[PDB]
Design a protein around this ligand. Sequence first.
Ligand SMILES: O=C1C=C(O)C[C@H](/C=C/[C@H]2CCCC[C@@H]2c2ccccc2)O1
Ligand SMILES: [Cl-]
Length: 134
Amino acid sequence: SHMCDAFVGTWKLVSSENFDDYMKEVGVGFATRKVAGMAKPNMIISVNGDVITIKSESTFKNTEISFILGQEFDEVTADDRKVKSTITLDGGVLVHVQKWDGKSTTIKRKREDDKLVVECVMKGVTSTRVYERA
Ligand SMILES: O=C1C=C(O)C[C@H](/C=C/[C@H]2CCCC[C@@H]2c2ccccc2)O1
Ligand SMILES: [Cl-]
């Protein structure tokens, strides 16, 4: 309990850097990158017992995952990858690893001041996405 209290809430994207390059590294195609890159999602995080739910809602896609920390799950990403995901808490940071077709990408979410900072990494390419409370 209270594992993720400082994450819970509704959050709105306010800045993005290097996201197109992250998506290219993942293998996202041109049209999806362009429409996805335009999106201004809200991220809605909630907890009920051991189950964490993260929703991403935008004009591009509305997605939802629910999970228990450390317990793998199957996820269809907004770009239609079929991945195996595990999310853990590492020193206060939510670490989300996605595996597919022999590839891996990690998305970290952390609280920094009044922001929720999301770092997306695929090999040598990192993208930073900043969210504030809605
Ligand atoms: O937790 C988060 C917070 C973030 O802002 C982005 C991050 C990754 C999402 C992208 C992965 C690659 C394909 C496009 C995906 C996408 C989904 C929804 C809306 C736009 C772009 O997920
Ligand atoms: Cl960007």
